[PDB]
Symmetry: C2
Subunit: 70 residues, 2 copies
């Protein structure tokens, strides 16, 4: 039904919000510290000197294990 | 259809995986450091001396800003 299409859309959008903002291909699993923006996979987070969201300096990257990880 | 009910269940499970494993009421927005388990809201994470997933001591809690975050 049309309701099935609406639910399919919500699921797709939520899953896309879990992907890296830089490569769009890998799951987010890294946090820029101390700002806390958690928007990248490990490979894209590795070379950023400043946070791509708020421009704060990245002192280090913390790896994150999320229950949503698939 | 039956597929509507199946998608409703997948959406419910995905939304529940984004809620605190301790209170089940607030969104996950905190990471236990250094282990990295990100399973609680800030209120539950502030009350734990050891990680509830791996039992490592919590040196500190890092707040996380996730693109999935929701709010009224
Ligand atoms: C990814 C796996 C295997 O590598 C190291 C240990 N791992 C985890 O801790 C995965 N994990 C279990 C529970 C969670 C949780 F934090 F998301 F709940 N992540
Ligand atoms: Zn990436
Ligand atoms: Zn930032
Ligand atoms: Zn909680
Ligand atoms: Zn842990």
């Amino acid at each position: 039904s049309q309701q099935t299409r609406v639910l399919q859309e919500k699921l797709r959008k939520l899953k896309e919000a879990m992907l890296c903002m830089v490569c769009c291909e890998e799951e987010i699993n890294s946090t820029f510290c101390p700002c806390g923006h958690t928007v990248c996979c490990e490979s894209c987070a590795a070379q950023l000197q400043s946070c791509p969201v708020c421009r704060s300096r990245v002192e280090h990257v913390q790896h994150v294990y999320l229950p949503t990880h698939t």
